[PDB]
């Protein structure tokens, strides 16, 4: 941490005003409750002790309702000038630190960007780390001012009132903080345990969705149903018991207040027969000290607030203050006139500064000449990119100064130097802006016409006007997403725009595809016409239509030439030895009531049929347990009735009765109150899992097409059924227990409010809707005013996020000033936005105030009225007014559930979206060809048109048609490799064919069932993926009933049995993502085995690569060979000449199938075809 006392370093003369009106309001806030009660004990006090007495009584408590008007527009002034002078001084001082941050984050050097921080720090630090500061200072003061003043302000009327009976409950609240602080340890340790199995059982469903496409092969979609199932159970047992410790420990709390309640009342009425102290006002000392002792751990959240923001100040003034002695542009510089283009390299080796021990250029020289487009080979392994990275003094050389028409850089403008270089980078690099910005980066002084005459040189503005918009679309987030081959075009025209002299295009060469190539090409063309550019070059159009090319030898130049002087070397043609790997990589890569929820929560409660011993046990004990807080306001509102009569032997066996009423309803408090939240927790935590292994044999039941549209990912899966029954139940399972407790605790309440007086009790009722707006209020002041903090700074946030991960193209066209520019355009709309909420704020809660106060004195005013006229008494206006004002602690309370009833909607939305989507194929469809046993295994492959459901651009395949007989093996041998998986892809049916019949031994496939068919068919992956289990296991997953002796047998025709049978834990070697890491050059070898114990007769071979090990090459073959024993294959060749040994051998052309056959039968009457020549070639 830096220091408190230094947060506030960007304070001007404005909040220093605004931060004495929030202090001085706040402080006043505080002290009207405690004062409050002393104006309330000294109008009861008036108002019992004139019984015979009238015109008086009307006299002295018409003057105190005079107060209350007074004491309810102290708060209306004084809550307007709190919330509003907090939030609107913690904005205006965290948007100047924010802005100021980024101007010097994207002006420091580059090499702070690696050593010192990293670049995935400097933009985290403005997403938290930035609003931490915010809030520390914004509205957690404010709320530390206030809960100090209640603190003091809570004791000092205590104390001055009676300091008798205020000793006794300062010696009483220590035994309340101690049951209630161990409560919430002794929950909250086991709130984070069970959230530790019900996360490590969220890793089955996130590592069957990654290996969908081997679960269904050797199905066992029934295995992973059944270890998801009995791996809840675990964390089902460990919340059974986080509803006993709450039960157990929200109960004793009812048994502590109620029984430290029973002391505090019999002493206060010893102390009233001694004529020590008045009737009301050992009822405002009780609560004036338990609130100023309650007050003070509500100061604890806004404590911790100090010291999290304190060490998270430290890493945003690191930066601010990092010194300038980054080599920042020196000003006193010297600039040329005739800039024509001479950059040379002289004795050039430089080292990267982290890690000062290591050379990249050791005696580098290089001379380009002017207007010429010279060209650079050297292809990664060398890095061929510090040259770029030099020029445009981003580091800096250690020896050897660089060379500009005579003149070194080390003294030129950087400003200017950089101003005559024009940069494209490989990858795109456009900022959140307009699309008339983003191209006017390159010169901020060109108008509109020169705008769209730079645009169609790159030939962009062709397609410009086919914007909804023209030059104004956002691009970035809402621009529609524009196409790559438009971002290269885009990036071009603002080089262009700057028209420079030193062009220094890199190589896109990443995803081009030639489509827009035709354009693209001919647009860079006349960019590098009459210029001096250096071109690295990975295209061969470039090299070949570009001027002599260097040659880079890890730190020097052998011999500069052009294509036809290094080319007619040969077997010395350096040049051409690395051509010809250059391209060899790349063919090989390729509204809620009754109408929007009626259905849905119906739905939901009627699958819970079989649990409902357990719902009417856990609301017959919570009926029970809301009127038993209705049965104590009534008690200590007819304590205080007694307290005023004028007999001193008959109060004693009055407070005699109801201080063991307290008591005897303390044991009913302890144990109605474990029945309410052990009950409840027993139906909430047998929903969930009952909603979630719904959610998981429905996912596992879809079609294949389905895993695959970026929205069911591998994530996205384990998120959507974790986030989505866990909100369930912590916004509906334990809501119910809280509106059935709290409509017995106003049905009571309303209900012997009108025995004793009813008259009053519409006065009472009447003015209900002011007073339930008034405590809601209240109850949402804890959590602050200040909502979506993150979501309102992020418009302008991601413009700062996508200007320091780019900084090298931020500070290439000296544009470091106007992306703060942009930055502070984007933070203005909050300040004018958070300025008129903090006073609607504060002008629609000190108005819900003073009417929560004016509606006191139009109820002891009227009760005091009908006093008058004998129509009621003291005792009987009193025991109506305090039993009915806390039915006002019911309906207040039960309408704070409105956001967790919105939300609830939209859980069982997504909850009830995935129960009904119908499948494509059902895996268990009945009425279906019954499957023959033992099978011939005549597989038929024929009229394969078919293309996939996700994207028919390209056909995949175009009528072919193989035949493997019942016996044999066949290939499928062909160029162009990673075009032949939708073959596999097919027998299995994970893409419906959409252009002919599949047929197996002369039925077809559709006719069968599909699980029917998968016990007889087996595949090996093209990369093994292996679960997290023992060896054992893994193995055991392909058949079902797999006995020891069978897999024993099974493992050692794989040659892997001795190689295992080292190993320190036998066979159970538990492999996973967490056990002991095998060789990846062995792991086919256990999929091997998986697949034969399946016995299967067609048995699909992928591939066997990814066996480096020229070791295990030999054993592979030997299993490989066994594979290819007795049974049909259909195996994938991405082998060289070794498949010599196929019967059947077939190619695939484009989607074509040319020739069949066998292997000898082609080489003697096909002397052109492909399959003769790739075999003495490839």
């Given at each position: 941490g830096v220091a408190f006392k230094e947060l506030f370093r960007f304070a001007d003369g404005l909040d220093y005003v605004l931060m004495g009106i929030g202090s001085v309001g706040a402080f006043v806030h505080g002290c009207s409750l405690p004062l409050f009660l002393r104006f309330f004990a000294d109008l009861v006090n008036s108002f019992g002790s004139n019984s015979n007495n009238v015109e008086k009584m009307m006299e002295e408590v018409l003057k105190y309702a005079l107060y209350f008007l007074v004491v309810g527009a102290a708060i209306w002034a004084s809550s307007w000038a709190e919330i509003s002078c907090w939030m609107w001084s913690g904005e205006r001082q965290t948007t100047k630190m924010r802005i100021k941050y980024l101007e010097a984050a994207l002006n420091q050097d580059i090499q702070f960007f690696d050593t010192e921080v990293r670049t995935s720090d400097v933009v985290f630090a403005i997403n938290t780390d930035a609003v931490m500061v915010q809030d520390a200072i914004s509205e957690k003061l404010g709320n530390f001012i206030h809960y100090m003043a209640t603190f003091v302000s809570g004791f000092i009327v205590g104390f001055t009132a009676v300091w008798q009976l205020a000793l006794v409950t300062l010696a009483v609240v220590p035994l309340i903080a101690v049951i209630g602080g161990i409560h919430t340890t002794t929950l909250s340790k086991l709130s984070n345990k069970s959230q530790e199995s019900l996360s490590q059982a969220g890793n089955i469903v996130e590592q069957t969705v990654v290996q969908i496409r081997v679960v269904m092969a050797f199905v066992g979609e029934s295995r992973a149903s059944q270890a998801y199932s009995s791996a809840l159970k675990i964390a089902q047992k460990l919340g059974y018991k986080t509803g006993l410790a709450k039960g157990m420990g929200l109960g004793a709390t009812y048994f502590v207040v109620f029984c430290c309640y029973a002391l505090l009342l019999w002493y206060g009425g010893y102390l009233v027969r001694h004529h020590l102290t008045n009737g009301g006002l050992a009822i405002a000392t009780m609560f004036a000290v338990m609130i100023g002792g309650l007050a003070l751990g509500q100061s604890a959240p806004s404590m911790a607030a100090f010291a999290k923001a304190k060490v998270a100040a430290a890493k945003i003034f690191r930066i601010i203050d990092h010194k300038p002695t980054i080599e920042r542009n020196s000003e006193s510089g010297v600039e040329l006139d005739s800039v024509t283009g001479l950059v040379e390299l002289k004795n050039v080796d430089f080292s990267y500064p982290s890690r000062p021990d290591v050379k990249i250029l050791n005696n580098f020289c290089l001379s380009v000449p002017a207007g010429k487009t010279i060209a650079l080979v050297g292809s990664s392994g060398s890095g061929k990119s510090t040259v770029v990275s030099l020029i445009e003094r981003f580091y800096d050389p250690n020896s050897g100064q660089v060379l500009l028409d005579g003149q070194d850089l080390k003294t030129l403008k950087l400003r200017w130097l950089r101003q005559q270089i024009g940069l494209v980078s490989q990858e795109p690099a456009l900022f959140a802006t307009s699309i008339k910005e983003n191209i006017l980066l390159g010169r901020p002084d060109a108008d509109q016409v020169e705008i769209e005459e730079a645009a169609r040189v790159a030939n962009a503005h062709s397609f410009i006007i086919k914007l909804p918009d023209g030059f104004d679309t956002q691009v970035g987030e809402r621009g529609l997403q524009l196409s790559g081959g438009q971002k290269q075009r885009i990036a071009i025209a603002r080089a262009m725009l700057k028209n420079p002299a030193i062009l220094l295009l890199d190589e896109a060469t990443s995803a081009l595809d030639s489509e827009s190539e035709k354009l693209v090409q001919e647009a860079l063309d006349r960019f590098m016409i009459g210029r001096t550019t250096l071109i690295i070059a990975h295209r061969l159009s470039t090299i070949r239509k570009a001027d002599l090319v260097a040659v880079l030898q890890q730190g020097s130049v052998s011999e500069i030439g052009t294509h036809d002087e290094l080319f007619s070397k040969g077997e010395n043609g350096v040049y051409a030895k690395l051509i010809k790997m250059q391209e060899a990589a790349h063919e090989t890569a390729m509204k809620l009531a009754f109408k929007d929820q009626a259905n849905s929560f119906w739905r939901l409660a009627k699958m819970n049929s079989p649990e409902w011993k357990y719902a009417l046990l856990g609301s017959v004990g919570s009926v029970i347990c809301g009127s038993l807080s209705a049965f104590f306001a009534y008690v200590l509102s007819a304590v205080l009735s007694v307290y005023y009569n004028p007999d001193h032997e008959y109060m004693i066996k009055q407070i005699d009765k109801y201080c063991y009423l307290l008591i005897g309803l303390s044991s009913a408090a302890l144990v109605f109150n474990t029945l309410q939240h052990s009950f409840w927790d027993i139906v909430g935590e047998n929903l969930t899992k009952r909603v979630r292994e719904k959610m998981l044999s429905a996912v596992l039941k879809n079609e294949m097409a389905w895993f695959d549209q970026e929205e069911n990912e591998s994530a996205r899966i384990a998120a959507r059924l974790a986030l989505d029954a866990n909100n369930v139940r912590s916004a509906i399972g334990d809501r119910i227990s809280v509106i059935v407790q709290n409509t017995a605790l106003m049905l009571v309440a309303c209900t012997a409010g009108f025995v004793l007086q009813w008259r009053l009790a519409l006065v009472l009722v009447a003015v209900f809707p002011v007073v339930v707006a008034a405590t809601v209020l209240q109850k949402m002041f804890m959590t602050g005013f200040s909502g979506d903090l993150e979501a309102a700074h992020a418009k302008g946030t991601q413009l700062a996020g996508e200007a320091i991960a780019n900084v090298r193209t931020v500070a290439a066209f000296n544009s470091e000033a106007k992306i703060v520019r942009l930055y502070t355009a984007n933070l203005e709309p909050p300040l004018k936005r958070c300025f008129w909420k903090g006073q609607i704020a504060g002008s629609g809660y000190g108005v819900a105030q003073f009417c929560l106060y004016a509606s006191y004195a139009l109820g002891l005013w009227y009760a005091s009225w009908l006093v008058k006229h004998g129509i009621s008494d003291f005792s009987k206006t009193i025991r109506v007014f305090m039993v009915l004002m806390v039915s006002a602690n019911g309906a207040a309370e039960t309408l704070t559930l409105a956001p967790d009833f919105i939300k609830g909607g939209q859980a069982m939305r997504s909850v009830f979206e995935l129960l009904?989507?119908?499948?494509?194929?059902?895996?268990?469809?009945?009425?279906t060809t019954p499957v023959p046993d033992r099978l011939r295994g005549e597989v038929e492959l024929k009229h394969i048109d078919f293309s996939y459901p996700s994207r028919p651009d390209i056909q995949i395949f175009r009528d072919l048609s193989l035949r493997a007989r019942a016996g044999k093996t066949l290939a499928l041998v062909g160029p162009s490799g990673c075009g032949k998986s939708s073959v596999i892809s097919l027998i299995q049916r994970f893409y419906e064919p959409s252009s002919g019949r599949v047929m197996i031994d002369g039925k077809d496939i559709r006719k069968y069932n599909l699980k029917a068919i998968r016990k007889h068919i087996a595949i090996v992956p093209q990369e093994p993926c292996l679960f997290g289990t023992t060896i054992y296991e893994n193995i055991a997953y392909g058949h079902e009933c797999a006995t020891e002796a069978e897999i024993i047998q099974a493992a050692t025709l794989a040659s892997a049995h001795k190689f295992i049978s080292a190993l320190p834990e036998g066979y159970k070697t538990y492999v996973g993502e967490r056990g002991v890491q095998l060789s990846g050059g062995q792991k086919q070898r256990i999929a091997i085995a998986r697949a034969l114990?399946?016995?299967?007769?067609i048995m699909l071979l992928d591939e066997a690569t990814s066996a480096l090990d020229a070791e295990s090459e030999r054993s592979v073959q030997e299993a490989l060979d066994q594979a290819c024993s007795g049974r049909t294959s259909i195996v994938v060749a991405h082998r060289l000449s070794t498949i010599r040994n196929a019967h059947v051998i077939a190619v695939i052309d484009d989607g074509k199938v040319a020739e069949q056959g066998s292997h000898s039968h082609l080489l003697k009457n096909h002397p052109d075809g492909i399959y003769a020549r790739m075999i003495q070639l490839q």
């Open positions: 009904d989507r119908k499948t494509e194929i059902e895996p268990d469809d009945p009425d114990v399946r016995k299967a007769e």
